[PDB]
Design a protein around this ligand. Structure first.
Ligand SMILES: C[S@@+](CC[C@H](N)C(=O)[O-])C[C@H]1O[C@@H](n2cnc3c(N)ncnc32)[C@H](O)[C@@H]1O
Length: 241
């Protein structure tokens, strides 16, 4: 679990994000333990340091909350969640959200489900599948108020993966690093074809790290055309921009 120092870092970082993480210290400590346990099994690799996990993953995920987009029982998709980021931190601090965490890798879906159970989270589930396939399902196509994604794909690709999941009026957040100018430059025309438009591009400093970040908001302004998203692998191989 999180050390006293680890808790203090999380707490301080949360404040800089405008959050009171005091009621959530235990949950994050429990999640960190889960990550430790899982990582321990693998012999070639190890979990990154406590401080790096708290700052570059717990707090990084929580930067989503700098955007005023998470009030009420919103239906949210975490696309390509991996080990549950940024989805799990988001769900912990915003319990009202109806969260579906998707990943094409079954073993990661299994971990997230385990974390949900262990943390005793309600209104959150992991789902095994490809974004391109799920976005063709009556259960999921344009059925989300929100979608988020970190470290999945360049904006041109990611926009095709995310936008089809959103109901009109909804919004997705593409979490990005220090530089986005190049990825953004050719984006607008592609967004429009997808029925989206660029919302806020919130530049901020990741607290306690010295590193810049960008939260790229993709608003759903109109229905996505039947063409999108294209079959699995196609957005990646033939990006819209
Ligand atoms: C680099 S990991 C990032 C994990 C997590 N989002 C994070 O930031 O820590 C990218 C994850 O997205 C998943 N992924 C990539 N493309 C996907 C797709 N088209 N549909 C579902 N999952 C996808 C991969 O399986 C992988 O686990």
């Amino acid at each position: 679990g999180l050390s006293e120092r680890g808790r203090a870092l999380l707490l301080e970082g949360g404040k800089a994000l405008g959050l009171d993480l005091k009621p959530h210290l235990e949950a994050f400590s429990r999640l960190y333990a889960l990550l430790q346990e899982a990582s321990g099994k693998v012999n070639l690799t190890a979990l990154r340091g406590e401080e790096e996990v708290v700052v570059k993953h717990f707090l990084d995920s929580l930067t989503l909350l700098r955007l005023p987009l998470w009030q009420g029982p919103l239906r949210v998709l975490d696309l390509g969640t991996g080990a549950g980021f940024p989805g799990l931190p988001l769900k912990i601090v915003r319990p009202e959200l109806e969260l579906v965490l998707v990943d094409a890798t079954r073993k990661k879906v299994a971990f997230v489900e385990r974390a949900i159970e262990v943390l005793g989270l309600k209104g959150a589930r992991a789902l095994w599948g490809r974004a391109e396939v799920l976005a063709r399902e009556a259960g999921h196509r344009e059925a989300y108020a929100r979608a988020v994604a970190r470290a999945v794909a360049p904006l041109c690709v990611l926009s095709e993966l995310l936008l089809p999941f959103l109901e009109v009026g909804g919004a997705a957040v593409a979490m990005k690093g220090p530089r986005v100018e190049e990825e953004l430059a050719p984006l607008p025309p592609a967004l429009e074809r997808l029925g989206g438009r660029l919302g806020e591009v919130l530049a901020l400093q990741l607290p306690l790290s010295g590193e810049a970040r960008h939260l790229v908001v993709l608003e759903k302004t109109a229905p996505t055309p039947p063409a999108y998203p294209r079959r699995p692998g196609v957005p990646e191989r033939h990006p819209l921009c």
